[PDB]
Each structure stands twice: as C-alpha cells, then as structure tokens.
Amino acid sequence: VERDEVAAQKRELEKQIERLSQPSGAEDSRMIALAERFGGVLLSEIYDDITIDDAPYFSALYGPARHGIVVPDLSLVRPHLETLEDCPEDLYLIEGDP
Amino acid sequence: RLIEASLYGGISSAITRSLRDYLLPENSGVRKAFQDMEAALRENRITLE
Amino acid sequence: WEEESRRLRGKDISPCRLLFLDQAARLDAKSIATLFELCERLQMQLIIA
C-alpha cells in the first residue's frame, strides 16, 4: 500500500512536470496550434520574460485568460470556430498586436 | 534560403531537394518526444547494466 | 509568408516582392515574356542578370 501510494504521488509529479515542460506555457496543443490556425500567439509567451515579481500580478490580472491567446482579429477566428470540438473545454481569444 | 534559391533557381539545383527545408517548419514536438524516448532508453540501459 | 503576415500587419500595408536570378541568359524571349506576365500578375520585382 505504501509503495502504491508513493507510485501515485510520483505519477502525479511526472504528469505535472510535463504540464510545465514545453514549449512556452503549459504545452504545445490546441493553444499553440492557434498560433498557426490564426496568428494566435500565446499570451503567456507574449510575456515570456515577465519578472517573477510582476508574474503574480500578471497571472492574477489575466485570470483564466492567463493562458489566453492574442489574435488581432477574433471575428476572423469565427470561420474556423466550428472546427474546435477537440479544444480545451473553454478557450480564450484576445484582440491586439501580439 | 529564399534568396539563394532564387539566385540559383531552376529545377536542376539543390533547391528541388532542399524544398523540404525551405517550405516546411521545424517541429519541436518530435524533437522533445525523441528526447523523452532517449531518457526512457537511458534508464532502461542503466537498469539492465 | 504574405498570407500569414498581412494578418499581423497594418491592414493597408502591402510588403514589397522582389526576386533574383544570376546567369539570366538561360532564359529566352518566351521565357522572359511569360515570367514578366506572371511577375506583373503578382506585382513583384525582378533582379535578373
């Protein structure tokens, strides 16, 4: 039982380390995919070199949109929006010059 | 690469093969996946030795 | 490249298009004519020597 508990802990740790791994932000998935589906640069990458002191403020301000994607036009994502069934259940999109 | 390929264009040139370079992005995902395989293999080798 | 970037640029900005070729004598009259046809159709500049 103890060994299995420790194994579960290690599995969680490894999964989360992966979650923090690449390439910027959490992962290369639908979110990084929007960087080419449209010009959807990742917000977190857009503040890649944020100072550790502003990083908490940045995170709190950006809220769940912390992992949002900056796209000068979101009327433009509209044509492809119907494609996104395989996407995080709830996906942020932002307007502005990345 | 666009520049030099235009400078020395035509079919009979390296361009026609280095197409796969000039047209295509470099994928970090496969690079990372290969590194992860490498780590797995390293651990396997260590254990076996 | 333009399809990608024009989205990420001022909506009234149209980047310049310019290409090159050395030993342009590998071209002949019809070659020149058709290349100019398509070049104009694509509003692009040539430095062919």
Kindly list the distances between the CA atom of residue C13 and the CA atoms of A37, A77, C9, in Å, as whole numbers in the listed order: 22, 21, 7
Cβ–Cβ contact A29 with B under 8 A: no
Work out how many CB contacts closer than 8 A connect A with B. 6
C9: helix, strand or coil: coil
Dihedral sign, Cα of residue A58, residue A59, residue A64, residue A66: positive
Query: HEC profile for B6-47?
Result: HHCCCCCCCHHHHHHHHCCCCCHHHHHHHHHHHHHHHHHHHH
Q: How far apart are the C-alpha atoms of A69 and A45, rounded to whole Å?
A: 9
Contact B28 A23 (CB under 8 A): yes
Q: A72 preceded by cis ω (within 30°)?
A: no
Query: Residue A39 in contact with residue C8, Cβ under 8 Å?
Result: yes
Q: How far apart are the C-alpha atoms of A47 and A63, rounded to whole Å?
A: 14
Chains with 3+ CB–CB pairs under 8 A to B are: A, C
The distance of Cα A95 from the centroid of its chain, to the nearest Å, equals: 16
Who's near A63: CB < 8 A, 6+ residues apart? none
Q: Which residues of A touch C4 (CB under 8 A)?
A: 39
